[PDB]
Design a protein around this ligand. Structure first.
Ligand SMILES: Nc1nc2c(ncn2[C@@H]2O[C@H](COP(=O)(O)OP(=O)(O)O)[C@@H](O)[C@H]2O)c(=O)[nH]1
Ligand SMILES: Nc1nc2c(ncn2[C@@H]2O[C@H](COP(=O)(O)OP(=O)(O)O)[C@@H](O)[C@H]2O)c(=O)[nH]1
Ligand SMILES: Nc1nc2c(ncn2[C@@H]2O[C@H](COP(=O)(O)OP(=O)(O)O)[C@@H](O)[C@H]2O)c(=O)[nH]1
Ligand SMILES: Nc1nc2c(ncn2[C@@H]2O[C@H](COP(=O)(O)OP(=O)(O)O)[C@@H](O)[C@H]2O)c(=O)[nH]1
Lengths: 414, 414, 414, 414
């Protein structure tokens, strides 16, 4: 268990029966980023110190996996032999493709194996609910795997659905491409399946969660760090991560361990919520320590807008909503209805919930502020896609410039 | 005086007439643990810096007693000669048993003596109320003494009753046994006496207070320690201890030095409370800084459940209740009756108080939160006993496994 | 972006759309002081980390400009050749005066140039609103430039108005003089223009903001610094500065990014406010975390009196008022009218606002206290001028004393 | 007393009551190496300059024993007559075997005798705890004796157990053989006894400590010697030795003379530790002067891996663990629990301690760094055995080559 939020604390300080989750994610962490996250996920144990999620970490080589603080070598999968690579994801693919790599398959086995190892007990049962695959884009490894997975799922190695945690980078046109295309492909896929399935079907691809780094850094600095001191010694990712994960984590806990005396969110919701939309999903966590409609709105707005996962996704491309407000039970001001209404309406502004599926919870806690967790799902494409698009152009060219300028510098010299 | 709680502080900051206790415990601290505790007890002095409890520390050898910060060598009793021992408590027994150790008696004298030294003044009067013997189980020394005491009491060396502070360890089947049996014997004894006495009789064995380490550690980490920094440098016991003792300590102080404008707990209560049940006793200290019935309940629940002394004792095997809520006098919300009722009822759920003896206090302070001290007494057996039972089996076997597995490893090699 | 106030934080934590200012100051920082400030100004970037003001730093030589943390050499203008100088501002003047320095003009070009560089984009457009020239008096460089500017403006190199940030020193008669005369000249100028213009005219000299160091230090120590620890390691200027700038800075932000649900201050106001009075302007920022008329008054009073910019300026020599209270929107106590009235009246005591121009805002925030920004403009002469006058006399003579005394010491010895 | 480590110093500088050991080794030093070591052991005296271990030195002839700096001729046992020998250990055996050497026995007597002389006082009591026999392999003398001992023990001349200090050489196939076989035999023996005994039995062969020279030299040079100057004049063994012995030595001292305020290692542990595993034992001493989990790990790792005694022994062939960290008592960072855990886990990676016996201490000192002594016991076979195996083949053949090549050189010439 790693608390790392007031909240978390609050929780933990309060309940200690926390031994219980909603969804058994099978954390496969790929690439620096993923791994890194994974360790955090890894950090969760219960109120009996029992891990929460089961986690494999993958990376190409061993060394790659040294700084992990929870992962053991066994869970450090790597495939090794050749030194160096071109960070093309095409390396990866090879290694499992007979044609390039005959022993392709050899590897696969071991994956299948370790999967077995890790995800069976001895019922041979998969002890997983959905695969949570974590990726940071531009990471060859990730990218390679990404696709890989798509196949694999098909190839039934994966019989749980996949949830994709994708970070959208910042800069570097190359990455941009890699990413975009990656996203594209996915997107296709996404599109295919709904019409390939019904639309009430378990989506093998449950949803996609994206994060923008850029945005985040900005945010991060926003939040200053004279509010603490070691802040003054931190890395943004390091923080970022915390939030991110925590959120997720948290929300998994909360319904499970909490109740309300009024509307009750629940796992199933989540399940629903997570599977079926199949697409782009976003979450807003809003501290609410100030108590009025206007501010409510603000923080709402803020939370959405100045959401952490925010990517300028196109709200009305959502189809489904969710979230809940964990509110103190003495917090009358919320008990009031107007509020609710207000809220409703508030949200309605980005698209009216009431045209789509979703629900909302309002749990109790005994905190001294409330946090509103908000989730919009099944969206398609965030405008960032575009922005990215534009930007890498605006980059590409920008160093074309630099290329031409200084091609001139060649000419200019004897 | 060592404060080490807000409370304690609060107290101390408030009253300074604290020169006064309810019960004169005679702290005999046996074994690492006991000693350690003892030092803390030892740390108490009055508002005139006058010690609170008188304390002997026992250990086998001198060195054993070095790190103590309050104990003087004089109060470091040890009996020495042979180097090393098997940590069998059977060592101890010998030393006072003529048959094994002829000079058995020689020692006894010195005990009797130092007891004299320490517990008489020069009225020859025992300046004690009840012996508080502190033990951590699995400690040969403790264990040896434990039994020893039973005899000794009989042997009238002890003319105050004994209260046993027992820690129940965590792991190691051996200990487990030692313990269990120890507990067993005690248990017997306990059983005997009530029927050996009346049931309205001064129980020579006033009660037993157990603590589970395991539980505690868990708890401890629960309580995080980013709430403080040096926390980030602490040992659980170190904290644990603090609580534990403090509690006790505290509660001894409080009635004595406090009043109420309503129901008044008092020493006698305590006395009653402590003597007669003769058996398993538990305490819940509940911060109440949140003010509603539900939360009241929660914290109640919490406190019981996620009590510190908690061991899954069998509530209805209690016979007697007590405790008090030290509440701020401006704290109207408590003044209200409903509350009381509520409380009553709340407790009623684990067994209905109103079928048994006990009482309850509600003192004032001028704190800005309240703490509810809750005591259930005269219980018999906590399910942990069992759990322990199961566990050591689950251990024993588990390393039988390891024994057989690797007996195989012998066979497997040439 | 550098936050450095709760407020700032509050702001920043709240809005992150802060990408937007009211007035584009063109910060020219002259002399140690100015530079220093400039760096701070320089520290501002937006919610997209986009600088706020554009800034040139001037100093005589390069080295002079080393410790700057944001200024780049390019923005470190210096003119160099001769080593040492007499800190006469008459050095400066020379350098741009053909007669003394034929290549006078050469320099000017570069100024004009860098001005170009810095203040055009490629529309050749000036990207500035008003020049904010920062000076600490007694600084030869500053002083030289001061005058220089007056000319330059005339000489149309400056086509934005100038706002002068002048610090009034503490001690040293020489400085005093330099200053006074400087002030005098300015004063003249000020006087001229109004009658040289209409009085409804864009004043090329928008206003003057003075700061007294002396006063400030006093204040500073007032504010203690056990309230923080590093305080215990600070320099007054360092703090001072922070305030000062911040204030300014802040106020530029706030209207721009904030609204109210009631009276709305706005840039134009500011503009008006800043241009037309042409003269002495002062600002009071009042935390209001205590909620009553009396205290309101107090803090008001305090703020004025024990304003930061305060110089014993002659209120009724003002002609124009402004400011706004950034108040929490839940802060009902302000919503109330009486309050307003009260305020009005309060201010009325130093001169009645209602005889002059100005306005006042009351924005919302969601802070948990309010800050009242108060501005009195178009004043002429603060009594400090005088005080200064007296003091340097009281100095001059005082070391005349010392001169005569110890001229005696010459005589007294063989 | 010879200090020769900071530590040792630290110790000695601190305590001077050092008059006290854990285990009375009876140092029999055989062969150059052993002797050499012995002298060092010999160098230990107490804080009252009282020798620590009692030591016989054996060698074949007198001259052999000249450079010893502590050994007296009396303790220079040699058996002499014939000049030269074939360094076959078979020489040795003869000398005590009636059949080859009738007067075999004559010698034996003298051994028995001097043993008597040296190891009785006049209680006729053996003043020994365990025989510490030191050997460097390939040393005929050693080797001969090795076996000899096995018999002798059986032959009850030895009634203390034997601990074998074996150096594994570097190169020379012959040695290799001699060694291997030696090791083999031993190994057998080892295997026999456990099944010959119970497994909870005092192993007559307490354990085996091996050292690799090769490894060591490498290490040695690693540690540079511009860190000192005379280093620049040293022999590796000379250093090596120091460490080695010292370690041992040290660890014998430390528990004995130190305490902790927390977990306490102790002799018994050692005893246990040393006797019962009967097999391969290894030790890691880790300076810890850097304070974080990662580094902790590192040094841990390092220490294990880049242990001094390290031989690529097969961790999981261990059965038993031990060690302790002598840490400064002000060293909070260790006091913290996480740490502990971490550690635990860390170790767990090579095999999980928690499946096997052992314990761990954490003593105080007042050093300004900590040293972690780590012990893995009861292992069987280190991969070096193998490596050796391979290598001598790789040698044997390699000079077969040279043999054939240059057999060709014969043919090639007339
Ligand atoms: N925020 C964050 N991004 C990371 C982290 N590690 C890597 N990334 C990002 O993930 C993307 C791909 O890099 P990486 O994960 O190293 O890919 P790899 O080279 O395939 O291992 C880049 O945008 C990295 O900045 C991480 O732990 N957190
Ligand atoms: N929490 C706690 N347990 C302790 C302390 N010292 C020892 N123990 C525990 O007491 C039990 C018996 O150990 P110990 O007191 O050393 O017994 P001894 O060997 O007879 O001195 C074990 O569970 C120890 O962990 C202490 O000061 N606090
Ligand atoms: N508060 C403050 N005053 C300063 C600072 N630097 C210089 N001054 C003051 O400005 C006045 C003129 O000094 P300076 O700026 O060094 O002039 P220069 O010699 O022309 O560079 C003096 O009163 C200095 O104390 C600064 O950064 N802050
Ligand atoms: N490190 C070390 N090895 C030694 C020393 N003396 C001898 N050896 C080694 O011990 C092994 C056997 O040689 P030695 O002791 O001379 O055997 P002997 O010929 O029977 O006396 C070889 O590997 C030697 O290098 C010593 O004092 N230290």
């Amino acid at each position: 268990m790693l608390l790392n939020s007031n909240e978390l604390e609050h929780i933990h300080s309060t309940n200690h029966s926390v031994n219980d989750i909603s969804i058994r994610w099978g954390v496969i962490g790929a690439g620096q980023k993923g791994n890194k996250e994974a360790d955090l996920f890894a950090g969760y144990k219960f109120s009996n110190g029992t891990t929460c999620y089961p986690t494999l970490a993958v990376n190409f080589a061993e060394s790659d996996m040294m700084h992990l603080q929870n992962i053991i070598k066994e869970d450090r999968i790597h495939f090794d032999g050749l030194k160096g690579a071109a960070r093309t994801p095409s390396v990866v693919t090879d290694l499992f493709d007979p044609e390039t790599n005959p022993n392709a398959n050899g590897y696969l086995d071991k994956l299948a194996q370790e999967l077995g190892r890790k995800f069976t007990n001895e019922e041979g049962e998969v002890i997983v609910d959905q695969f949570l695959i974590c990726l940071g884009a531009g990471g060859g490894v990730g990218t390679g795997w990404g696709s890989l997975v798509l196949q694999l799922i098909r190839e039934q190695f994966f019989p749980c659905p996949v949830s994709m945690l994708i970070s959208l980078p910042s800069g570097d046109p190359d990455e941009i491409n890699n990413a975009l295309v990656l996203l594209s492909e996915i997107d296709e896929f996404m599109r295919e399946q709904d019409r390939l399935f019904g639309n009430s079907d378990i989506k093998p691809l449950a949803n996609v969660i994206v994060n923008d780094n850029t945005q985040m850094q900005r945010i991060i600095e926003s939040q200053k760090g004279t509010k603490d001191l070691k802040n003054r010694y931190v890395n943004w990712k390091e923080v970022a991560n915390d939030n991110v994960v925590s959120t997720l984590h948290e929300i998994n806990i909360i319904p499970e361990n909490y109740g309300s005396d009024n509307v009750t969110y629940d796992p199933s919701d989540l399940i629903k919520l997570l599977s079926i939309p199949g697409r782009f999903l976003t979450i807003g966590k809003a501290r609410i320590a100030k108590f009025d409609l206007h501010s409510l709105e603000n923080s709402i707005k803020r939370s959405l807008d100045e959401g952490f996962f925010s990517a300028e996704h196109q709200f009305e491309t959502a189809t489904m909503y969710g979230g809940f407000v964990l509110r103190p039970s003495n917090a009358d001001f919320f008990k009031d209805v107007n509020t609710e209404n207000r809220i409703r309406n508030t949200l309605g502004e980005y698209k009216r919930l009431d045209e789509i599926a979703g629900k909302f919870g309002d749990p109790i806690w005994d905190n001294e502020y409330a946090v509103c967790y908000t989730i919009f799902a099944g969206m398609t494409m965030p405008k960032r896609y575009i922005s990215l698009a534009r930007e890498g152009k605006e980059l590409a060219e920008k160093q074309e410039q630099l290329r031409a300028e200084a091609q001139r510098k060649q000419d200019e010299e004897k």
